[PDB]
Amino acid sequence: KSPTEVLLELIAEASGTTREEVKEKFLKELRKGKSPTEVLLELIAEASGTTKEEVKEKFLKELSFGKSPTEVLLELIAEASGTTKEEVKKKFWKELS
Numbered sequence: 174k175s176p177t178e179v180l181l182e183l184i185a186e187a188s189g190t191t192r193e194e195v196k197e198k199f200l201k202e203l204r205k206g207k208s209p210t211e212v213l214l215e216l217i218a219e220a221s222g223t224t225k226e227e228v229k230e231k232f233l234k235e236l237s238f239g240k241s242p243t244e245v246l247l248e249l250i251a252e253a254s255g256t257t258k259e260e261v262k263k264k265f266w267k268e269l270s
C-alpha cells in the first residue's frame with residue numbers, strides 16, 4: 174500500500190466513515206488542483222470538526238518545530254480520533270509494508 178492510501182484509511186476510521194467516501198472526497202478536491210497534503214489536512218479537519226485554517230496552522234507550527242509532514246499528519250489523525258500518536262503511527266507502518 175501507499176502512504177496516501179494508508180492515510181485515507183486512517184482518516185476514514187477517525188471520521189467514522191467509509192474508505193470509499195473519503196477516497197471520493199479526496200479525488201474531488203485533488204481535481205480542483207489541490208496538493209494531496211492540503212486535501213489530507215482538509216479531510217482531517219472534517220474528521221476533527223475544526224476549521225481547515227486551524228488544522229493548516231497547526232500542521233505548520235509542528236512542521237516548524239522540525240517534525241516531518243507524515244509524522245505530523247499521523248499526530249493530527251490521532252487527535253481527530255482521540256487516540257495515541259504512538260498508536261496511529263503503528264497502524265500506519267503495519268499497513269504500509
